[PDB]
Amino acid sequence: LIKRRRKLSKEVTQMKRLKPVSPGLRWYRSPIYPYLYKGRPVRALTVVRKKHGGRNNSGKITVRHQGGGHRNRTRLIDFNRWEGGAQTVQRIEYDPGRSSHIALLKHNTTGELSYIIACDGLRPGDVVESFRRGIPLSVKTTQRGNCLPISMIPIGTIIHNVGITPVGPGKFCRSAGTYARVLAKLPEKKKAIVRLQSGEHRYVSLEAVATIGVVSNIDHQNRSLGKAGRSRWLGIRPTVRGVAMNKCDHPHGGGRGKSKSNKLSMSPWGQLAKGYKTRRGKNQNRMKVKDRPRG
């Protein structure tokens, strides 16, 4: 079994590219995941994702660049895990509404189904558990796939989903390939110190859930969309540069020929785009302990 595991670890995810018969196919690059299920999700666990186009309830675009991608079904995925008891992972699926893969768990006592975010090496046929509801010697608990309060995880262990409050769901490190690490634990204050994917070291409540391991689809980073069309399919409308506009529209607008107009890089609404911290003064993350690396 150990040998098999080792072999699996060794095996790298290939990067599929078609023959460059069109100039757009030249730079399309996607990771292959062959163990990743083929078919559909469970209709009882999906709801329609209703497209907004980046328009607010005013009808006005509030967030630019959002637009008409493919039709999409949202999968209700469990970021909570309040169930407890073993669960066999039936299959690992593609989720269009997030970068990570998702795993379909069947709970063994009941036969009831749920989706989780898939951990890195998780595979169909594996078994995981949840320990929100206490334990009912120790190392059997801590293994990639299962969730538990941070109070139960050994210091130094890499984890992915991280809650903020005890009663609350996993908010942090849910994207493809991401992960956090438990740095310290303070029982007296009821806080643990977690370093998040950015590198910030932050206080999190002790009873806050986390699931062990790294988020799956680590190779997602390297995928190269090959053509404009692909972005469009993903609901990403084109971004127009300030410099290509007129002063009425953007601070960078105007000028005969291309020119930054000796104006500090800034947004269309005038706030600075390089370096300027936007959360500042009184409002600020109290639980910040050690700051992120750059700014």
Partner RNA sequence: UAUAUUAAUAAUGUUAUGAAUAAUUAUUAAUAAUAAUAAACUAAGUGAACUGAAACAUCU
Partner RNA sequence: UUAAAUUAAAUAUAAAUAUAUUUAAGAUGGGAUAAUCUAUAUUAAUAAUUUAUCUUAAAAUAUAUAAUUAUAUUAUAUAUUAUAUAUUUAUAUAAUAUAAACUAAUAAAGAUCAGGAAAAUUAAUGUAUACCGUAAUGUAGACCGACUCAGGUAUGUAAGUAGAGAAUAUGAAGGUGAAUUAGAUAAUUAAAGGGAAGGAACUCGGCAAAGAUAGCUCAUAAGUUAGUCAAUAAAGAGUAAUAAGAACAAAGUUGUACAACUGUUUACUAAAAACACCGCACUUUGCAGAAACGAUAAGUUUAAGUAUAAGGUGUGAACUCUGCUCCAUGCUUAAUAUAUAAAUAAAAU
Partner RNA sequence: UAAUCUUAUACUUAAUUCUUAAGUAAUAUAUAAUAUAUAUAUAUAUUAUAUAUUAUAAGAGA
Binding site for Na ion (CB under 5 A): 252, 254-255, 259, 261
Q: Which is nearer to Mg ion, 108 or 259 (CB)?
A: 259
Closest CA to 195 of 207, 181, 209, 208: 181
**Sole window of 58-66, 82-90, 129-137, 144-152 interacting with RNA (rule: CB under 7 A):** 58-66
Is residue 12 a contact residue for RNA (CB under 7 A)?
Answer: no
State in angstroms the smallest separation of the CB of 93 from RNA: 7
> How many Å apart are CA 195 and CA 290, to the nearest integer?
9
> How many Å apart are CA 212 and CA 115, to the nearest integer?
16
Residue 98: Cβ within 10 Å count = 17
Give which of Mg ion, RNA, Na ion, none residue 273 binds (C-beta under 5 to 8 Å, depending on kind): RNA
Is residue 26 a contact residue for RNA (CB under 7 A)?
Answer: yes
State in angstroms the smallest separation of the CB of 274 from RNA: 5
DSSP 55: B
Among positions 101-160, residues that touch RNA (CB under 7 A) are none
Among positions 196-215, residues that touch RNA (CB under 7 A) are 196-198, 200, 202, 205, 207, 215
State in angstroms the smallest separation of the CB of 87 from RNA: 19
Q: Which is nearer to Na ion, 269 or 286 (CB)?
A: 269
Among positions 219-278, residues that touch Mg ion (CB under 5 A) are 257
CA angle 126, 132, 135 (to 5 degrees): 80
Q: CB pairs under 8 A, 24+ apart, for 47-55?
A: 47/73, 47/74, 47/76, 48/73, 48/74, 49/73, 49/74, 49/97, 51/235
Which helix (DSSP H) or strand (DSSP E) does residue 128 occupy? strand 127-128
Is residue 186 a contact residue for RNA (CB under 7 A)?
Answer: no
Instruction: Determine the 3-state secondary structure of 45 from DSSP.
Output: helix
Is residue 281 a contact residue for RNA (CB under 7 A)?
Answer: no
State in angstroms the smallest separation of the CB of 81 from Na ion: 52
Q: Point out which residues bind Mg ion (CB under 5 A).
A: 257
